[PDB]
Design a protein around this ligand. Structure first.
Ligand SMILES: *Cc1ccc([N+](=O)[O-])c(OS(=O)(=O)C(C)C)c1
Ligand SMILES: *Cc1ccc([N+](=O)[O-])c(OS(=O)(=O)C(C)C)c1
Ligand SMILES: [Ca+2]
Ligand SMILES: [Ca+2]
Ligand SMILES: [Cl-]
Ligand SMILES: [Cl-]
Lengths: 9, 228, 228, 9
């Protein structure tokens, strides 16, 4: 399913 | 490449590149910062991770589009282009893994840094596993598992069950079990146990930490809903 | 770069790259196809335009973000990075203009192709003008105006007022007048006249052509609503 | 305002 999106900091 | 630019300038430009949604630039700036040889602060680790996550995320999405077209077709063009994207994706994963191996992990002594980098190592081997075929796949899968397992062992000993890094590691390891290792029962068990142990620790948190932890707990619940 | 790949394979890969949202690849494939030296079909012209529009669109969005940060600040990093993005954007515009000049425009005899390429020429000079400063800006602005004007002259002589290329050319020339040439009254007049003349010609169209033309007419109306 | 979006074919 979904991993940590992790595209915003 | 970035050897002539000051470390602080590379970090500043990585933040600007994030604002401009220039993630390839952001990754190059952060690679340059890592290659200065100093350890990364918490904020700098996040910048490194965000940069490469966006780069490899675009490549993974393109590879999935091309792989789906290729499977429907079965000229050489679809396969050739999927292979090109795949090689580029593998090159980015190898670059990230190389930074972790030279020398981020070996210098990471605190739990927050070491768990962060080992989770990254598991994630990038996992992205390699998504495109691997055969016995190559087996050793790549074991490398992902080994990195995630070391990170899990440290996180259980050194961090509270609500720590966002610990929660995100467990989330991603559960995805590894479900999507890569053909172990959906292990994925579900890990997600449930992680969620329940975090729930029981929420009472210790401030309002801001509560928001951080419950956000990731909801991702665990979303996966559990899809898997059960 | 692409000289070893068949023209038909470059076109096929450009279509795959579009599906994969790999617009830099798509632009490189279409540049390779243009450099084969043959004229482009209607579909191939559209692929060339879509590829470079997406590439330069990302660069323009990043330049605007960085320029806004730079203006708020007034170290060298913000200016240095805005300059880097700007140079990359100028390089893409110069590449497109070079393809049009060698030798797409000179071989384009039919109104649909010649108007399409001249509109592109005006658009890419317009993107250069967005980042230009001073007297450089003046000659770039005149180059955009001259290309748009030649395209307009051909389109009024050779195409019906509902033709989507003619409509999109007028839309973009009106934006040039409003945003670049400091001529908002000319922008409004052009948009109104274009809209009204298209409206009066809709009765001649099939259902599918009606949909194509009214879509662009709505963009003219959207601009007129913002400008008045 | 808005030019032809032109990013989809
Ligand atoms: C893998 C991971 C889990 C949690 C966090 N976090 O909420 O801090 C994290 O940091 S992050 O900035 O990269 C976030 C995924 C945007 C990473
Ligand atoms: C500049 C322009 C105007 C109209 C059309 N069109 O509706 O055909 C056009 O072609 S396109 O495929 O690039 C469209 C903007 C997606 C271009
Ligand atoms: Ca220094
Ligand atoms: Ca040939
Ligand atoms: Cl250390
Ligand atoms: Cl011709």
């Amino acid at each position: 399913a979904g991993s940590i999106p992790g595209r915003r900091s | 490449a970035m050897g002539s630019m000051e470390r602080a300038s590379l970090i500043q430009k990585a933040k600007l590149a994030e604002q401009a949604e220039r993630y390839e630039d952001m990754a190059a700036f952060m690679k340059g910062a890592v290659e200065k040889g100093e350890e990364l602060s918490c904020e700098e680790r996040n910048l490194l991770s965000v940069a490469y996550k966006n780069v490899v995320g675009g490549q993974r999405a393109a590879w999935r589009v091309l792989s789906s077209i290729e499977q429907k077709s079965n000229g050489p063009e679809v396969r050739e282009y999927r292979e090109k994207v795949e090689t580029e994706l593998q090159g980015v994963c190898d670059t990230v893994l190389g930074l972790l191996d030279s020398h981020l992990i070996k210098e990471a002594g605190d739990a927050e840094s070491r768990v962060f980098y080992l989770k990254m190592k598991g994630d990038y081997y996992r992205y390699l596993a998504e495109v691997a075929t055969g016995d190559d796949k087996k050793r790549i899968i074991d490398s992902a598992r080994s990195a995630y397992q070391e990170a899990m062992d440290i996180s259980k000993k050194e961090m509270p069950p609500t720590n966002p890094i610990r929660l995100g590691l467990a989330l991603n390891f559960s995805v590894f079990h479900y999507e890569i290792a053909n172990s959906p029962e292990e994925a579900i068990s890990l997600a449930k146990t992680t969620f329940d142990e975090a729930m029981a620790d929420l009472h210790t948190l401030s309002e801001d930490s509560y928001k951080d932890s419950t956000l990731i707990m909801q991702l665990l619940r979303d996966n559990l809903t899809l898997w059960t």
